[PDB]
Each structure stands twice: as C-alpha cells, then as structure tokens.
Amino acid sequence: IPTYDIYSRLLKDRIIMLGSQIDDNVANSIVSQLLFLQAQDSEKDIYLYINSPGGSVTAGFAIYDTIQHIKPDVQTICIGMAASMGSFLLAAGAKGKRFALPNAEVMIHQPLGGAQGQATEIEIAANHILKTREKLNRILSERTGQSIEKIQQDTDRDNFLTAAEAKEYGLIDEVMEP
Amino acid sequence: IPTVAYDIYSRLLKDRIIMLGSQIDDNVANSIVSQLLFLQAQDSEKDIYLYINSPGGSVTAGFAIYDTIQHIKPDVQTICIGMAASMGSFLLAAGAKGKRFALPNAEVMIHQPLGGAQGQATEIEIAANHILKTREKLNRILSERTGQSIEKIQQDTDRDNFLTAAEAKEYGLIDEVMEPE
Amino acid sequence: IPTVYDIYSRLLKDRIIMLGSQIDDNVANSIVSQLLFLQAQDSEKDIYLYINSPGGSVTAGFAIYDTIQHIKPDVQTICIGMAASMGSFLLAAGAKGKRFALPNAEVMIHQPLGGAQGQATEIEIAANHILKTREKLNRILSERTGQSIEKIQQDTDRDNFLTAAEAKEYGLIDEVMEP
Amino acid sequence: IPTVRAYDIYSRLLKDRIIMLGSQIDDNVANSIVSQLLFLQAQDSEKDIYLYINSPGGSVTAGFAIYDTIQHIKPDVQTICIGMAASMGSFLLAAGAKGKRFALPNAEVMIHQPLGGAQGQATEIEIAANHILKTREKLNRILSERTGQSIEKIQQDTDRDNFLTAAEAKEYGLIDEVMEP
Amino acid sequence: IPTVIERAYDIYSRLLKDRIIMLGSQIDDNVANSIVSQLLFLQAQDSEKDIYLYINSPGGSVTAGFAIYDTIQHIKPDVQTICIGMAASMGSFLLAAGAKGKRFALPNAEVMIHQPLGGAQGQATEIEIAANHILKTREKLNRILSERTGQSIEKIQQDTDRDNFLTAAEAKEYGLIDEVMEPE
Amino acid sequence: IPTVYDIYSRLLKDRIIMLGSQIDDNVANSIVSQLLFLQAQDSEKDIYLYINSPGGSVTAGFAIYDTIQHIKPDVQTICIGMAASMGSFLLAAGAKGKRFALPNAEVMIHQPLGGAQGQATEIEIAANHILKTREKLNRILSERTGQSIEKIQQDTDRDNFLTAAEAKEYGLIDEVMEPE
Amino acid sequence: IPTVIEYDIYSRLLKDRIIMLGSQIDDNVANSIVSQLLFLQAQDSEKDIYLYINSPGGSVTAGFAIYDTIQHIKPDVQTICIGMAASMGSFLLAAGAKGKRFALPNAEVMIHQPLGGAQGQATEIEIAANHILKTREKLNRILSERTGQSIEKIQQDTDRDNFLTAAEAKEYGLIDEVMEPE
Amino acid sequence: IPTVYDIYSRLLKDRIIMLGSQIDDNVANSIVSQLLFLQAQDSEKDIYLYINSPGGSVTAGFAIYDTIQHIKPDVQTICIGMAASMGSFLLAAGAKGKRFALPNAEVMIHQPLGGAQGQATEIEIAANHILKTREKLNRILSERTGQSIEKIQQDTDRDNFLTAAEAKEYGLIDEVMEPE
Amino acid sequence: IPTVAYDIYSRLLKDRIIMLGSQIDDNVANSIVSQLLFLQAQDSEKDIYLYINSPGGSVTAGFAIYDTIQHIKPDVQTICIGMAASMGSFLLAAGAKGKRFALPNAEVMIHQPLGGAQGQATEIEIAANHILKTREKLNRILSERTGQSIEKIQQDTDRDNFLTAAEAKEYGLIDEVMEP
Amino acid sequence: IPTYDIYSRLLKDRIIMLGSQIDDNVANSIVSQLLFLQAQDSEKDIYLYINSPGGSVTAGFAIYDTIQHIKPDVQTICIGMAASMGSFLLAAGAKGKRFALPNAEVMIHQPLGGAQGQATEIEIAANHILKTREKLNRILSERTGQSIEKIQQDTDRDNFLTAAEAKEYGLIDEVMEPE
Amino acid sequence: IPTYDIYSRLLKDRIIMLGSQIDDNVANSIVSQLLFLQAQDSEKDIYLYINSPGGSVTAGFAIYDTIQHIKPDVQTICIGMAASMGSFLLAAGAKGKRFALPNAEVMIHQPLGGAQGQATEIEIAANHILKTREKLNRILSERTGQSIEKIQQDTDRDNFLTAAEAKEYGLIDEVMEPE
C-alpha cells in the first residue's frame, strides 16, 4: 500500500512478490511482470519471492512455463510459506538460485480437485487429475533429483518440510542465512 | 393421508400392495424392505404387487430393494405408473419375469449412474473406479433382466433415454403394457 | 382437518376423492391408492373426483390418468374453483357424460413447462422429451374433447382461460352443474 | 386445540352444522369447507348450515369453490361475520342465503378489487391482465346480484380498500341483519 | 401439555369441561377462532352457568379481539374475566368486556392500555384510507372502553395516547375490572 | 417423553408439577392450569412444585405467583439444579416452611431485564415501568424472605449466585433437603 | 410408515426379533438400537436377533454403544447387510455372531479410517489426535479379531475408502456368507 | 497490480494483449477495443494475444474472433496455463503459423453449455439455437484445424483435455514454444 | 481496463468510436448519449462508429440512445460484434441506412418486449396497456427501418427469433455483412 | 466513465445529465452543478437532460427550487423516460425551453410513501403526504396550465404519456424533432 | 488516510507501522518495506512500531526471518498491544533495541490451529503444529534468555505481561519513558 507502491518500487529492482494464493489473476500479473522484466533486460536475474499456500495448477504452470521460457535466470526465495503449487514454483527457480529463509515452511502434497455428474464424466475428470499429478511428479523429479516413485510416496499426504529439509530433498539449493 | 383405523397405504398393504412413489433413499428402502419381509412372513406363496412411480435415487438403497425382491419366495409384480426413471426403472425390470407391467402412458427412463468426488487425486480415482464398477454391476443385471447385450445397455444409458410403455416392452424392461380393464 | 376419521376419510367412505392441491408424486400416490382401494371395495359403483388444482407434474398426473382409465368403476370429475394445466387434463379424463364443472369454476389449458441445463446434447434430449410429452397430451386431449390435434396445439400455445360454459363448448366437460 | 369419542372443538361444532372459516382462503381451506358442506348436506339436506366468517380473504378461485358449493347444495347456508370479512371473505359473507346473512355489531367488512401479478412477454402480460379483468367483472356481477347495488357502483366502491361497519354493510346489501346481543 | 385421567384430556380440555377458557397467547385469527368456538360450545352445553375466561395476553389483532368481544356480548351466559400476569392492548379490552361485577385481576397482574398500532404503504390515497380506518378503529375502541369503565371518551383518548401501565388496584379504580381477587 | 400418560401427567396424578424450563406465557399457562386442576381435585392436600428454571417473563412468573398465593392448598417448592431470576422468585413463593433446595442446587437473584426503543417519552415510559416492576419484585421478596427492601435492592443489583445453604440463610428457602 | 393389524412396520418386525438399522449412526439411533436389543433379551435371552444393516456409518462412540451391547447380551445377533454397510456400519456388520453375518449378493461393504476434527491450542490438537489414533487402533484391533486378517493388513486396507462386493466381504472375513435367493 | 503505466498497459504499448480470465461481454469489449487500437497505431506489426482462459460466453468469444479475422495485423496466440472451451477456440483463431502453446499448457475442447426454461416451444427454440451455435463452432474449428466436422463433433461430446503437443497434432496450434 | 492518459475507451472515443458492450440500462444510456452529444459538438460532419455487443435491456434507456442517434447531425454507423439481442438489435437497425453492419459470426435476435405487473386489477391493466403500446411503437419503427410489414414484424417477434448476420441483412436489420 | 469524465466535459458546455433515480445524493450533485454554472455565467442557459424513473420528493424539490432560484434559464430535455419526480422536474424548466425527444416517455402519478406505528403517527404521516401531493399538484398546475382537479384525476394512477401528449398536456413545450 | 500517505512519509524516515493482525498481506508489505529500507541504506537503523494481536505463524516468520536477514538493525517499539506473533516480532528486534511504552501490553501463548479429515491427516496436522510450537519456543528462548521448559510453561495459556514485566522476562530491553 505505501507510496509507486512498495511493490512497484521492488519491481524496478527486478523483484516480484508472490504473496497470495495462485489463481488466474495472480498468474496473469506474475507472467506480465516476467515478460516486462525480460523486455527491459534479457540478461539480469529476476528475483521471485514466494509466500503462497498454492492454488490453481494451470495458473501455476502459466508462471512455471514463463519462468522456463524467458532468457533471464529467475531466482526463487521462499519467505514464510511455499505450499503445493507454491513449493512447485519454488523448485522451478534457476538451479543453484533457489532459496528459503531458515524458518520458511515448504509443503508438498498431491493435487486436489472435484468431479460431479455421470460416471463417464467422473472418469474423465479422474483421468485428467491423475495425468496432472503425473506431469507434476515428473517435473518435480527432474528439478529435485528424486525418483518419481519417491515423489509419489512423499506427496501422497500433506508433507511439511523445514527449509533445511527442503534443501535435503532438492526443492531448494541453499538456506539463505542471516 | 386419508383414513380407512388405517391410512390408505397400510390398507393397501393388507392386500399385499406396496406403493413406491418417491425418490429412493435409505429411509424409503427400509420401509419397502420391511414391507416385503412382512408380507413373506404372512404368506410366502401369494404374489406381491409393487407399484412404482419414482424418479430414482440412491443406487445402494435401490439394491436393498432389488436383493430383497430376489431373495423372498413370493413373486413381486412391478407396475409402473407415471414415471420409472434411473434406479426406479431398474426396480421395474426387477419384478418377477412375466409379471412386469407399465400403464400405457407411463414413462420409463434409463441412464448411467450419477455421483461426485472431491479431494486428492487418489480419492477421486477411488470414487471413479467405484462408480464405474457400480455401473458395470447395473448393466450386467439389466442385461440379465432384459435380454439385451451389456454393450447395448452401455450405449443406451450413455445419456438420458426416455421410453414409452410400448418401447419399454420392446426393450425387455417390462413384460406387458396393462391395457384398460 | 375436522374429525367426524377426518373429513376427507369420511367422504372417501362415500367414494368421494378430493383433489385440491398441486399435482406432485405424493398427491398422485394418494389419489391412485384411493382409486385402487375404491375399486377393490366395489368395482361397480361410481367414483367422484373433485378437482381444484393449478396442475403440477405431468408424469404424476398421468399416474392418476392411467389409473382412472384402468379401473372398472366410472370416475366422475367435478371441477370446483380451478382446473388448470394437468388439472384440466384430469378433469377431461372423467367418464364421458360424467365430467362436470360448477358455474364459476375456471378451466385453463396451456402447453407443458419444463427446464434444461448443461450441454447442447442434453438440452436437445430434454427438448425432444418435452415436445414428445406435449404431443402425447394433445393427442389424448383431442380424443376426449373431440377437437382436432392442431386445434388443441393452437389453443394451448399460451395460457387459455375458459369459463365452465366455454369448457363445455370445448369438450373438456359434459355439463355445467346447475344448483 | 381443546378436546371434547374424542373431538376437537371444531368437530364438535361441525356436529351442530356449524363451520368455522377463521383464516385466509387458499386451496387447502376451500377443500376443508367444501368437504364439510358436502358432508352436512349428505347427513341432512334440510337443516340450515351455519358458516362463521373471520377471514382477510385469499384466493379468488378457492373462494369460488366455496361460493359455488354453497349455491349448489340444498341446505341454506347462513353466513355470520365475526371480527373481519375482507376481500374474498366479504364475497362469501354476501353469498349466504338471502335473509340469513349476518354480522356482529363490531365486525368489519372490507371490499376491494382483486389482486394479481404478471411476468414475461407482452402477450403473456396481456393474457394475465385480461384474465384478472374478467375475474373482477365476474365478482362484481355476482356482487351486484347479491347486494342490489349497480355494477357501476360496485366498480367505483371497490376501486380501493373500502372498509364498512356492520351497519354500513347492511345498508350496502352485503348482509341482511346486524345480529344484536 | 399434561394429560388428565377421567377418557383422556389435555389440561386445557379438562378445564373446558368446567367452563374455563384459557387465553394465554397473542390474539390472532386462530386464537380468536378457538375462543369463539369454545364460547359457542359452552353456551350450547348450558346457557345459564357462568363461563370463566382467564386472560394472560399481550394483545394482538384488533379485529380478532372483536370476534371474541362480540361473542362474549352475544351469548346468554355471563363471561367472567380473570387477568393473571398481563392483559395488554386488546387483552385489557377483553378483560373489560367481562360481565359487569365479574371482571377480576389477581393482585400482581398487569394491565396496559394504549392506542392501536398499524401500518400503511403505497399511494397517498391508500395511506389516507388506512389512516382513516385505524382512526375510526380507535374511536370504536375508545367508545366501548368508555361505556365499560365509566370514564369519559376524552379521558380514554388521553390515557391511551401512550403506553399506560396499571396495577390491578389501579385497574379497578379505572373501571377496567370490578375487584382485585385476594388470596382465599 | 416416556409413557407410563406421559411421565409428567403421571406425576401430576400425585399432585407434582415439574417446572424445568424457561418461564414464558405458555409455561405459565400450563402451570396455572395444573394448579387450578389440582385445587379442584382436592383443596386440602399439598401440591409439590419442582423448579429447575433460568427465569423468564416477569408477567408470566407473576401469573404463577398469584395463582400459588390464591389457591387453598399449600404449594411446596423444590429447587433442583438451578432457580435463577423469576425462577428463584417462584422458589421463595412456596408455602412457608415448605420451600426446599437440594444440596447442590443453585439459586440466583438479580434485577429484571428489559428494553426500550423510540421517542424520549416512550423510553421514559418503559423505564418507569421496569422500575415499578423491580420495586414490586423487591417488595414481595422482602415479605417472603424477611430481608429489608434496601438489602434486596443491593443484592439484586448484579447477578447474585447462592448455594442452597446460603439461600436458606438468606430466607429464599426454609430447608436444604438432605438425602433420606 | 405403514401400520399393521394384530404397530408400524418396524414394530411388527421387532416382535419377530428383527431390528432395522437403515440410517446414519448417531446417539439417537444407537440409543434406539441398544434399547431394542435389551428389550429383545428381556423377552428371550436365548433366541437369535436379526439386525439388518443399511448404513453409511456415523458416530464411532454411538456404534460402540451398539457393538458392546451386541457382545454383552446372551442372544446371538445376526447381521444382514442390504444395500450398503460403510464405515461404522461395516464394523457393526462384522460384529454379528460368527457364522451369522450375511450380505445380500449386490450389497456393498466399505471400510476406511475414522474421521474427525480438532480446533484450538497445540495441546488441544495433540489431545484430539492421540484420541482419534487410539480410536482407530481399537477399531482395527477388533476388526482383525473378527475377520482373521492381520492388523497391519487391516491398517493398509482402511487407509483410504475401500469398497468390497458381498463376495469379497466374505473372502475378507467381514461376513460369513453371501445370502443367496433361498 | 504493479506500476511501471500499470503492467498490462505497458505490455499493450508493445502490442501485447492479456486474456487471462473468463470470457464475458466486458472482457470481449476490452479485447476488441485493444485490437482496434493496435491496428489504428500500426496495421502492419503483429499483435500478440496471450490466452489463459477457462472459456466463457460464446457470443463474447465470437466478438473477439471476428475482430481478429477482420483487422489487418496478424494476431499471434500464445496459450499459457489453460485454454479451455471458448478459450481454446480463440487459441486456434490466431494467424496460421503463429499459434503457440507453452510446453505444460493445457488445452480443453468440449461442446457449448447452456440452459432453457419455460414452455415446450421456448425450450425447442433454445435447443435449436444452441445446436446451431455448436454447428457454427465446429465448422470454423474444422477450417482452422483441418479436422473433419464429424471428428470435431465426436471429440467435443465430452470434456477433451489435450497437452500442448497433442494440441499441435490436432491442429489447434502450430508449434509448441520451447524455451529460449 | 488498459491505459493508453486515457483508458482504452476514451482513446477510441477520440477517433469517434463508441463501444456498447453490455446490457442496456439508464447508466449505459447516459454514457452513450453523452458520448453521442459530445462527438456532435466536436464535429457535426464526421461519421460516428457505434459497436454493439448487447443482450438488450431497458426499452426506454434504448430509446434515449435511439432518439439521440436520430437527432444528431453526424451519421452513426452501427457494427454488431458477437450479439445484438432485444433492444440491442433495435439499436443496430437504428444506424444510418447503408452503414449498418454485422461481423460474419455475429448473432442478431429479435423478440417482443418483456415486463411485469403487480397489484390491483386496474394497475395490471395500466401496465399491460403500456407494454402493448411500447411493442407497437417498437414494431412501427422496426418496420420503417427494415422495410418489413408490421404484421410480419409482429409474427417474427412473437418468440425469440435468432438470425445469423447474413439473415439479418436479408431481413433489413443491417445493410452489409462486414467481410475480412 | 470515459476520459475529465464525459459528464464533466459536458458540464463545461453547461450540460447536466440527470439519468438515474432521484435521491439526496443525486439532488445534491445536480444542485451543486446548477449553483456552479450560475457562478461561472449567470446569463447563458443551462441544459438539464432528464432520464429518470423518479425518486425522493424532497430531493426533487431541492433540484426544483434551485432551478427556480438561479438566474440562468434551465432547459429541460427528456430522453427515454421522465417518470414521477422526473416528469415534475421536466415541467420545471424555463417555459418555452422544455423538450422531449419524439419517442421519449413521460409518466405522472401521485406520490408514494409509508407509515408505521400508532394511529396518531399514521395520521400525521397521511396528512403530510396529502399536503405533499397538493403542493405537487398546485405547482404542476402552474407549470402546465391544467386545473388542479385535472391533475388530481390524471395522477390518481400511473399515467403514461407520449412526447406529443406531454406537449399537449403542458409538461413540455416542444417535441424536439431530428434536425 | 491523511496525505504520500502518512505511512509512506514515515517510511521515508525508515519507520514501519505494524498496526493490524498479521496475515500474508501484512507480512508481504512489511517484508517489502524492510528490503526497500535496506536497499536505501544498509546501515541506518529501522524502526518497527508494533500494535498487533498476532495472526499467521508463517506470515510472522516471513517478517521474522527478513528482520534477521537484513543488515540494518531493526528496532521494535510496542504501543498498545503485542500479542501472540506480535509479541514474537517484538522480541525479534535488535538486542538492546526492543522497547515498550509504559502502558503497552504483551501477551504470549501457544499457537492456534485446526485439523479435519482422516486420523492420519489429523496426526500430520498435530505433528506439524507441535513442531511449530517447538520452533517458536526455541527462538523465544534464544531471544529472551529463558529456558525452553520455562517458555513452554509460560505459554501454555494466555499470559499477559505489563511493559515492566516484559523487560523482566527479556522480551524487551527497555520501557521507553516520556521524553
């Protein structure tokens, strides 16, 4: 809120604040800031702070694919909480530049959804969310180094990790020390 | 509502007539099952008459009625008046062979089961496998009671399929269209 | 409500059935049960069906209609106040020569009402169903009034209100019950 | 509520050929009143029937169900207004046997034109507006026959809410006598 | 609620056998319908013995109250009125409607009198019609109240302009009741 | 709920009345009717009124109070669990010497509650009325407990919770009913 | 609803020692079932009781009120699953007298982990978690004893919603026989 | 939210339009206005339409579709995250050869949704209208993807989820945009 | 939403383009009429371009736009994108003859006006007469703007009548289907 | 909405847009614009466009009295609809300078209100709304040339007028034809 | 509200106002202001006023770690109330630079939460909040000098402390007396 606003002040330094649930509106803003920062400079790093409980998988992949597509490296810094799609985006930062503060929290679990209607419709919705989890686990495996079956068992239920445990798992590269 | 002391439905139950005239839930199934068991204890040989005017409802509650019909000794005649849809048409086809009826302007509708699921991907998969297996159980039995192939029933229940009384007889869901006496 | 049995059970003893509400499945179950009970009591004596109804479910009304046509006793229909939509259909369903309306009773006919939501294919199925239901209703109305099917179709396109006298002219009833 | 076999107070009055109309007029109320009228005629077509009226009015068609039944049955129906007879209630008050329409000294009688609603296309609103206009003319026509007032005066006096004392109601022709203690 | 052995009664039906009617709620058309029926029933059973109407009511519909009022005045038996707890608005009106000399209140019963309440919505003519009706309704109420209490019409008007709470003793002084029923 | 009649009608046959709810017009209408019926049955034998009430309408409670004072039979009052507000007032209304409370029963006294809305004169009328109602309640409470009016006034200024033993010393009851 | 000459339909069946459990299990339902069991034992402490079960489950403590009453009374209680016996309902199905536990051919049996909630301070959440974990262990231990399956197999088979046919329920040990048309 | 202009107006300055919400009349009004404006500034330079949409109004989508087909500049479509229903229709509406999706974007096609209530005649009119709308949608989709109408009809009978690679084989896009 | 400082609509208004992309109520009519009066004050000669994507709305609000279009000196071109239904199709037909357009997949729907009435019989009669005159006024003008007879307009508007852009030109509601 | 906003741009040309219900907030804004336009120039006319279903009578009189008080002539132009208090303000323009577009609608009726509480309070409220109606009819008579009795009978119910009928009635002076 | 706004003007003097519950939006703003002030000058002190009832633990740890990470000293000044995570952030200021006004209140207690679903899910949520409490108590022990067992005992229930008691406890360093 304070006055640019404080977030526009940080965007001038190539800092993007992801501090809410991930929906289409939030992803639209994040993607727009990433494309804008690349147009200003395709070389300088981008810093993405993440304090998010997660949200839409497709909105998160809109942010994910934009991070992977642009030329600048995107650093991810977890403050407070990165859960579900938020922890997925935390692990999506440039390798070697994924961070979490010492008391930040990281949670991974399988995606949530719903289905209602005829049996055939329920089957279509189930197949889709199973394919979405399979896509999420495959990418999570390549960016953390863990096996796919390891990701599958560790995300079957809510799995809370400290910043240090997230580094052990491969979700981040360094615990950003004071 | 009216009194005969009996209410009109208890008076008809004295004549071994059971009225199914609502959605099928656990409470309705309990009453129907209880009435079927009671009538068998009264006389295990005389026929039972099950009138059906139902838009359907719970599949498991409908199977409680189905299995009780198949288990008891008396033949259960089914008579469709107005509407037999979904589980209601399934119970209509469940009557004693040769004793399944529909009135000339009664309507019969068949379709695939309805349900819902929410939560983790694993939970949605479990619910989807269950409702898919429930549909296979319904189609297998429907195949046994109508003579149609399982693949034909699968195709005919993909969407809401409305049949007249005569079409229901052609399909094998009922045996006779009761003509005015 | 009053006790004599309640007033309706007392009239049922005289083979009188009161239809005085919207027609839904519960009402149809009671009417059908009372009709079947009266035939089992005596398959010869007439039954008297009073009708004061704004209509309701078409399938529930056909449960009553088909039961009237099936049982052996003649079913007289007497319209008091209002017989609209499925209510006027049941009024015309009484035994020919024994369908009545009181002088100030109102009879209304119109096409069926319904709804559809979802995919285009589902809307098509629902549209075909209600169109087939209307054709079935108009065909029966044609046989019981003597009017042509196209005449029934045109006269039910919108709400069509009839006096008791106009209902006799149309063929929906046979006689206006005079005092 | 009170109990007087076991009857409620209204069933006890019904044995004396007294019917209590003490609520708004809907299809359910009209069902009860009409059934009581038919019942009292079957028991005895000669003795008078006494209809007490305390009603704010209600459905016009439900009120005509009571009206036509009153006119059709053989016994005379006396109408006695207690408290209030408004709208369709005052119509039924005037429907009693001529010479046997009463109101208690502090009872109130209110007459006005019928109320309704319309929604949709212009043709649908025209149809609904036409229907309620025919209904008012039917009500005023009969009210003209039952009171001796002209149709034009009834139209003018019912354009809005018209409250009448018992004495004014007798002067107008809605009742025949003010029942004094 | 309770049942009394005899057939089977509820407590109010048992009291009705002794010609006792309990008015213990708001006055609406249903309550008035019940009271009137009990009064007519008791007169048919015996046209000479007194009827006892206990009143604990906050008031209610004025026209429903007059349905009870006119039936009291019309039947032959005397109707004694006994206020317990509260007789407010139409309730105090019906309390004053009992047979002269047979209107009572218990020592700590409360009596409240005020002008009638109502509402009006719509066009100016419609509000004028409703205003005239409730103004004439008050004059009718005040006219009868003057006749049954002995107070002048102008005094009734002034004493009912606002909520006027009276003790049982003050209600006897006012003329709303005849006697304060003391512990026998 | 259970049938023997229901359990309350069966106790009414033994002249026992159960007050186990908040006091409104319906409850008072029932209690008063039961009292009059029991007096008609026998004007000599005692009546037993069990009281487990959080209080309620003051006018409804006075309908019960005045009926108790008016009838010929003595009305014994027995507090089980809780007698608060108008309920403790009815507890103190029992026959002198025949007012009881069980050892762990609770008695609470406080000043009456109400509301007022509208013009200043209308608020003045409602305030005078509730002030006159409290003075009436405190006056009677003084006569039935022996405490002074000034003492009742301050002891009801706020919620005042009393044990069964304190209620007997205060004069609200005569005896703490010990296990027999 | 219907009335019978000689009752409502359920009271008439109760004279033949038949109890109908056809709703969710809460304290009111368990209160009624327990009362009917005690009444039938007082009528005759020897003859069998027939408990029909069509229930999606409900309160665990309410179900244990029914369970312990079954185990406590002298008569054998036969259980018949019609339609569906899920959660606490499938537990009570397995609670019938050994050899007298049945399911109709198309009846469904579902087993899963108990459900609950907790709100407040960390200690309050810890107390609630420990309690629901002991409750699950109590259910699984008893389920193991009445089916013959090992406890670890019960634990894995109840981790998620597990639907069984009548035939699979007999194979599992939850019932003894699939009741075929006589 | 952030200010640079706001982030979206700055991208519009580079001829970039953001469709990242449900499609209604207001969103279509905005997209159409931006398209006409970018053509007025320069009728030659390409326009880039990013699509992250669950779909929405069919008529609102056709307002966007017809404007794309009408203006002189080529409109490139880039699907990020999700293009479902009318959103996937607009994705296929880009200039041939310039329709893209990111590797993990999802594309969903299905038949249009609607409702109808009232008289049988009114339900018939609404059913015929939505059936005609589907036929119009399938014909255009056939022209833009190369699939037959019968194939479009069968593949949209229910929700049909496609990966970015599957969408390119289907003809909805031309290339899967790989990282630069 | 986007900024050009102008919003996207003010920038288009600078080029004499007015965007109608919502239901027609008094608020929208105020904006459109104000933009029409403003553009005439700017230049009474140059054409005005009114884009229409509207499901209809208030008839009197639409006549505020209609009469202002007919009154001002500049020609007002109407371009239907997506949907022109009810009062929206009325305003589409209200453009300068020869300059009324629709995009190829835009939809046009005509029907009779909708309304409601509640209260006394006389009040319902007043509302019925009023909406009947409004329909005749609409049909009279519609006949003049399309060349169809009023009896044909009456029968073609009895129910929802959906027209493609090409059918709308055949009917006389537009002059040209704007091709790419 | 469009960019000043479009109404402020018209306000510089002494054009005021009344296109909503008349409440205190709207009347406050209109009054402020009228006072502002007089301060800038007390001689040139002011143009008040009216598209309103009516609203508060006191809010409408705040606009009415300000129009009558300021020195510049206030022209009134009805577009779409001027109902109830809106048609009252339409008739309040400078004589000779009150207009309506050809298809604009004008509706007149009696004022609406409510009353609740004691009989005395209802009497006060009825007397007040009756005085408000006569005040409205008296002014309407002065501005239209119609008699007070004619206004009373013509406003007893909703009375809808075309633009031509409104000029005939005296509510406006000219039907503004397409120049 | 007053006009920069008053908070941006104070931010220009390196003053940050925390005067609400701590949720993600608040934490995001505080963290951004902290990073902004460090970029402005990594040496000059920062002043964090705290009047907060607490809130999200993860949101509070976002503020906590950012305070600990940046180079400038962050002074904390409690005005009114610092409860729950608010008292945690108060104790998080630079040693020697934690203050409370004389009538300010400090409250400490154990974390609050909820859990719903299967027993395993409830076990996971219980284990997580128990780890969160131990993490909070460990750091609180590190910043106050009290033992872990004492912190656990003193946070079992709501524990209200005066400003003087808070300094006694080690949560703050000085009670700021009026200058």
- Residue E58, classed as helix, strand or coil, is coil
- Residue B162, classed as helix, strand or coil, is strand
CA distance E107 to chain F (A): 7
CA distance J10 to chain I (A): 7
Token digits of residue K83? 């409860």
Using alpha carbons, list the distances in angstroms from residue B105 to C31, C64, D145, E170.
17, 10, 46, 75
Using alpha carbons, list the distances in angstroms from residue K17 to A70, K9, K41.
37, 11, 19
- What gap in Å lies between CA H31 and CA A5, rounded to an integer? 27
CB contact under 8 A, A118 and B112: yes
Q: Radius of gyration of chain G from Cα atoms? A: 17
Token digits of residue G9? 């339909």
Is D45 tagged catalytic? no
- Residue J8, classed as helix, strand or coil, is helix
DSSP chain D: --B----BHHHHHHHTTEEEE-S-B-HHHHHHHHHHHHHHHHH-SSS-EEEEEEE--B-HHHHHHHHHHHHHSSS-EEEEEEEEEETHHHHHHTTSPTT-EEE-TT-EEEE---EEEEEEEHHHHHHHHHHHHHHHHHHHHHHHHHH---HHHHHHHTSS-EEEEHHHHHHHTS-SEE---
DSSP chain A: -----HHHHHHHTTEEEE-S-B-HHHHHHHHHHHHHHHHH-SSS-EEEEEEE--B-HHHHHHHHHHHHHSSS-EEEEEEEEEETHHHHHHTTSPTT-EEE-TT-EEEE---EEEEEEEHHHHHHHHHHHHHHHHHHHHHHHHHH---HHHHHHHTSS-EEEEHHHHHHHTS-SEE---
Q: Hey, which chains touch C, using 3+ CB pairs under 8 Å?
A: B, D, H
Q: Please report how many Cα atoms fall inside a 13 Å half-sphere around the Cα of residue G46, on the Cβ side.
A: 0
Amino acid symbol at J35: L
Flag whether C touches D (3+ CB pairs, 8 A cutoff). yes
Token digits of residue J72? 């510049």
Flag whether I touches G (3+ CB pairs, 8 A cutoff). no
**Residue among D131, D67, D69, D89 nearest C84 (CA):** D131
The dihedrals phi and psi of J155, each to the nearest 5 degrees, come to -110, 5
Which residues of chain K does A176 touch, with a Cβ-Cβ cutoff of 8 Å? 69
Token digits of residue G58? 């409900």
* Chain D, chain I: beta-carbon pairs less than 8 Å apart: 73
- What gap in Å lies between CA B87 and CA B102, rounded to an integer? 16
- What gap in Å lies between CA D79 and CA D96, rounded to an integer? 5
Which residues of chain J does E121 touch, with a Cβ-Cβ cutoff of 8 Å? 113-115
- Residue K77, classed as helix, strand or coil, is strand
Chain E residues interacting with chain J (CB cutoff of 8 angstroms): 114-125, 127-128, 130-131, 134-135, 137-138, 161
The dihedrals phi and psi of I58, each to the nearest 5 degrees, come to -65, 130
- What gap in Å lies between CA E172 and CA E149, rounded to an integer? 9
Q: Hey, which chains touch F, using 3+ CB pairs under 8 Å?
A: E
Is J32 tagged catalytic? no
- What gap in Å lies between CA B15 and CA I149, rounded to an integer? 68
Using alpha carbons, list the distances in angstroms from residue A32 to B135, D51, H19.
47, 79, 11
* Interface test with chain G among K108, K118, K121, K155, by most G beta carbons within 10 Å: K118
Amino acid symbol at G126: E
Catalytic residue from among G23, G59, G112, G144: G112
Q: State the catalytic residues of H.
A: 85, 110
**Backbone break loci in chain D, preceding residues, C–N > 2.5 A:** 4
Q: Is-contact E104 E176, C-beta < 8 A?
A: no
Token digits of residue G80? 């018949």
Q: Distance between the two ends of chain I, CA-based, in angstroms?
A: 27
The dihedrals phi and psi of H78, each to the nearest 5 degrees, come to -130, 115
**Residue among F72, F24, F78, F84 nearest F51 (CA):** F78
Which residues of chain G does B70 touch, with a Cβ-Cβ cutoff of 8 Å? 105, 181
- What gap in Å lies between CA G61 and CA D89, rounded to an integer? 57
- What gap in Å lies between CA D162 and CA J141, rounded to an integer? 30
Flag whether D touches A (3+ CB pairs, 8 A cutoff). no
Chain I residues interacting with chain H (CB cutoff of 8 angstroms): 1-4, 8-9, 11-12, 15, 17, 19, 21-22, 51, 53-55, 81-83, 103-107, 159-160, 162, 178, 180
Amino acid symbol at F106: E
- b/e for G130-149, b at 16 or more Cβ within 10 A? eebbebbeebbebbbebbeb
DSSP state of G47: S
**Residue among J176, J174, J173, J172 nearest J82 (CA):** J172
| Paired residues of E27 in beta bridges | E60
- What gap in Å lies between CA K156 and CA K166, rounded to an integer? 17
CB contact under 8 A, I125 and D129: yes
Token digits of residue I10? 């003010």
Neighbours of F134 (CB within 10 A): 17
The structure was resolved experimentally with X-ray
Q: Please report how many Cα atoms fall inside a 13 Å half-sphere around the Cα of residue F162, on the Cβ side.
A: 26
Placement of tokens 């009872």 in the chain: D107
- Residue K109, classed as helix, strand or coil, is coil
For residues B125, B131, B134, B140, the Cα torsion angle rounded to the nearest 10 degrees is: -90
Q: Is-contact G140 G155, C-beta < 8 A?
A: yes
The dihedrals phi and psi of G49, each to the nearest 5 degrees, come to -115, 145
Q: Is-contact H45 H10, C-beta < 8 A?
A: no
Q: Please report how many Cα atoms fall inside a 13 Å half-sphere around the Cα of residue K36, on the Cβ side.
A: 26
Q: Is-contact F56 F89, C-beta < 8 A?
A: no
- Residue C65, classed as helix, strand or coil, is helix
Resolution in angstroms comes to: 2.4
* Interface test with chain A among B87, B111, B120, by most A beta carbons within 10 Å: B120
- What gap in Å lies between CA G62 and CA I125, rounded to an integer? 63
| Paired residues of A22 in beta bridges | A55
CA quadruple I29, I35, I40, I41: dihedral sign: positive
Three-class SS string for chain I?
CCECCCEHHHHHHHCCEEEECCCECHHHHHHHHHHHHHHHHHCCCCCEEEEEEECCECHHHHHHHHHHHHHCCCCEEEEEEEEEECHHHHHHCCCCCCCEEECCCCEEEECCCEEEEEEEHHHHHHHHHHHHHHHHHHHHHHHHHHCCCHHHHHHHCCCCEEEEHHHHHHHCCCCEECCC
Q: Is-contact I35 I9, C-beta < 8 A?
A: no
Which residues of chain C does D30 touch, with a Cβ-Cβ cutoff of 8 Å? 20, 52, 80-81
Distance of CA D69 to the CA centre of its chain: 12
CB contact under 8 A, E36 and D13: no
- What gap in Å lies between CA K18 and CA A163, rounded to an integer? 26
Token digits of residue A80? 């407070």
Token digits of residue B83? 């509407």
DSSP state of C49: E
CB contact under 8 A, H119 and C131: no
The dihedrals phi and psi of I75, each to the nearest 5 degrees, come to -65, 135
Token digits of residue E109? 């019963």
Neighbours of D125 (CB within 10 A): 25
CB contact under 8 A, A51 and K29: no
